Amino acid sequence: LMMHSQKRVVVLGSGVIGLSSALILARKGYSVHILARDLPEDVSSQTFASPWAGANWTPFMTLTDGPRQAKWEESTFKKWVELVPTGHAMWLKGTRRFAQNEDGLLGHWYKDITPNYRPLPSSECPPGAIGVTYDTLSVHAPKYCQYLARELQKLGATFERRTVTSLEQAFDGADLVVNATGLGAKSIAGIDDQAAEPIRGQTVLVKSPCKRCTMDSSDPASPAYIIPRPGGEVICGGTYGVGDWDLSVNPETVQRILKHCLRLDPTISSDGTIEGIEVLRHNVGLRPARRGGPRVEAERIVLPLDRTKSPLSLGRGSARAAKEKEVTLVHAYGFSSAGYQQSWGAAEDVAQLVDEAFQRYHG
Amino acid sequence: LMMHSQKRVVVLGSGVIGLSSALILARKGYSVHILARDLPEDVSSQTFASPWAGANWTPFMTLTDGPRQAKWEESTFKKWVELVPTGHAMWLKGTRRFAQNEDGLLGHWYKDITPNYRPLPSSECPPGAIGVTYDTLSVHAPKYCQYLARELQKLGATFERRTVTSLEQAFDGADLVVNATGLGAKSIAGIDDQAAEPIRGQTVLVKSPCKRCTMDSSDPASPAYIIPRPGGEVICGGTYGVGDWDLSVNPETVQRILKHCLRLDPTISSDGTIEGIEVLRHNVGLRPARRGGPRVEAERIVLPLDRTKSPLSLGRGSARAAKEKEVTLVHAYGFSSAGYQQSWGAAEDVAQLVDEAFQRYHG
Ligand SMILES: Cc1cc2nc3c(=O)[nH]c(=O)nc-3n(C[C@H](O)[C@H](O)[C@H](O)COP(=O)(O)OP(=O)(O)OC[C@H]3O[C@@H](n4cnc5c(N)ncnc54)[C@H](O)[C@@H]3O)c2cc1C
Ligand SMILES: Cc1cc2nc3c(=O)[nH]c(=O)nc-3n(C[C@H](O)[C@H](O)[C@H](O)COP(=O)(O)OP(=O)(O)OC[C@H]3O[C@@H](n4cnc5c(N)ncnc54)[C@H](O)[C@@H]3O)c2cc1C
């Protein structure tokens, strides 16, 4: 007769959001099991977003447009500062950010967070653009997820590969599931979120000692960015193909990205020429976005699902009776281009929801 | 001092085409190593097509339009007949095929191959349509690939998971590679085939004793098919989304498919109603097609690649000298909706090409 945990949770999804959520929950003493198709070792899988990120910290919204986003970003920045001494985050000093106009600078909301925030002279901006410079942070996206997974291991979390098609498959040994499935949220019966949408991102991974980050959104015909990451590599971007699921490498996009990035910073090349850029890999990832913005909220759901709850429910459309339980589903998906920079704060909110659901529904 | 094989080949890709090609090569005494991202155990992976097929034998082209296709289909039918006694293929007796008009029946070219080929009365066709009936064959797509893999094991072939980005990575221990990468052919440096394109196929897998196959192309607004497969299941289709990469399940498509299939054959349901259909799974696969049709041909290529051979070549665009070898690349991809039904014959042609390249270039 052993005393068993009464704090079992399943985290569905093992991208940066599921991992982060799982880790804060494990630290809170929950017994966490992670079910996911794609795990942190899957560093070249295109069926999730987390391998493909820069990943730096670049707010995309004003406070009014994205209040949660800013909260989550501010918390995550603090966490990443803490990870610098052990090398899991890296300073991007004198990052340059260009926008089409003052509006594009988002009210400078984050100017107390990123050190050394100041306007750039126009001489230091692309023609016609406006700019600021500041010190921000980046992580090595796949290695960051792997770091989180090691931390999870130590805290007793376990992992299992599984591809779920219906919610009851996730409610396996737990009455609460954290739904961190990115794009998968659309096709799991019981979630069925039609608002989930990819935003396609093509990049070039380059071998370069360049330590300068440049984020250029000043040309609406050509998104571009240069994001150094721990390890002597830089990610050159990019694209924002809303609703585009295409996983193939576009060769014209390669040329556009490298030419633009070279304009922004010739030192990504050995000799300031395209031909001098040491290409390591051509990448395409699908950012997991959601119309209406990220979904971070707790839902109460009765199982088994019926065809009235979900067009994708399994079995015959005639459903009832056998057996019925009510469970908690805590959503955490749709972070689009900002999943890493929001991850820790989002995970904090997820963990608060789990605590509250446990109080209300799970003893 | 052992006598080593001088007949090493690598097969890049482990869908039905790579497996089939590998098997005929292994039977011919080649030492085959298969490199692929997706292997036969990966029965729910959307990053290759082979898990998702019916898979039956339904010619799609006239002889003039598709001479190779017909050759390959006729050979594969013979192979599948041979697999009936051991249950790896199954007869679909009295299959019904509907088309918009006589042209859609493709000159009835295959009428000596499928037993009991005859026209259907209009009373037995959807309104306004034309039809034929015949006996054809199907295989259980994932299990068929697994069968091929067991056969390969016995013949000494080996498997390795790898995701290649540049050809030199495939020319690993062999001077000849069979390129059977489906959609991946577009993004591998040294292949770079812009003509590769997905054709998206959504299906519903249903639990039903229905043993009748119905192929309906008589409604251009609603492709539909019912394909029984070994094991008491039927695949209900479908879609042909050319250029569509969307991996998510469309709920409207579910309704359209099931309603149409039910019109075609109520016995896919327990009670002839939608609500009586026992749904097992909602599936989306991307058929690996190619503008210009399937590519089955041998190419001679110099390694290392340079940026002049490939926009996606790795390293700096300034390339030369170090070291240079010429190798053989035997293409086998772009089979679209007919990869299973063409597989054995296509593999025969691939093996002939390998034999010929070995004579000409490899001693
Ligand atoms: C080119 C590119 C650049 C980026 N740069 C940055 C950056 O600088 N900063 C930033 O903050 N972000 C950046 N992002 C965004 C970031 O990659 C994402 O927002 C983030 O990875 C989302 O994490 P997630 O955990 O929500 O989703 P994912 O990483 O997509 O993980 C979803 C998880 O759910 C699993 N799953 C899905 N469906 C099922 C199922 N049915 N059954 C079981 N498991 C399932 C997946 O397999 C996987 O484990 C970039 C993304 C890209 C493509
Ligand atoms: C809904 C649906 C229904 C179908 N019904 C039928 C049917 O009834 N009859 C029929 O004949 N066909 C049918 N098909 C078509 C059939 O599924 C395909 O044509 C066939 O599976 C193609 O096989 P393949 O080996 O060429 O490609 P794939 O199965 O796509 O395999 C490509 C292989 O290459 C690997 N690869 C790709 N890129 C890389 C890389 N960079 N590095 C390493 N490996 C890589 C893949 O991982 C995988 O091993 C259907 C398909 C679908 C979606």
From Swiss-Prot, chains A, B:
GO biological process: D-amino acid catabolic process; D-amino acid metabolic process; nitrogen utilization
Keyword Cytoplasm tagged: no
Effect of G201D: Increases activity on D-alanine
InterPro entries hit by this protein: D-amino_acid_oxidase_CS (IPR006181), DAO (IPR023209), FAD-dep_OxRdtase (IPR006076)
Stated consequence of mutating K323M: Increases activity at low oxygen and D-alanine concentrations
UniProt entry keywords in alphabetical sequence: FAD, Flavoprotein, Glycoprotein, Oxidoreductase, Peroxisome, Signal
Residues annotated for anthranilate 2 binding in this entry: F60, Y240
Location in the cell: Peroxisome matrix
Quaternary context: Homodimer.
Protein name as annotated: D-amino-acid oxidase
Biotechnology: Capable of converting cephalosporin C (CPC) into 7-beta-(5-carboxy-5-oxopentanamido)-cephalosporinic acid, an initial material of different beta-lactam antibiotics. Has been used as a biosensor to detect and quantify D-amino acids; when the technology was implanted in the cortex of rats, the increase in the concentration of D-serine following an intraperitoneal injection could be sensed. Has been used to resolve racemic mixtures of D,L-amino acids to yield enantiomerically pure isomers for pharmacological and peptide research uses.
Sequence positions that bind FAD: 14, 17, 37-38, 49-50, 54, 56, 164, 287, 336-337, 339-341
pH dependence: Optimum pH is 8-10.
Residues involved in anthranilate 1 binding: Y225, R287, S337
GO CC term (a single one): peroxisome
Residues binding (R)-lactate: Y225, Y240, R287, S337
Glycosylation sites: N179
Outcome, altering Q255R: Increases activity on D-arginine
Regulation: Inhibited by high concentrations of hydrogen peroxide.
Any GO molecular function: FAD binding
Catalytic reactions of this protein: a D-alpha-amino acid + O2 + H2O = a 2-oxocarboxylate + H2O2 + NH4(+); D-leucine + O2 + H2O = 4-methyl-2-oxopentanoate + H2O2 + NH4(+); D-alanine + O2 + H2O = pyruvate + H2O2 + NH4(+); D-glutamate + O2 + H2O = H2O2 + 2-oxoglutarate + NH4(+)
A Pfam family of this chain: DAO
Cofactor requirement: FAD
Major subcellular location class: other
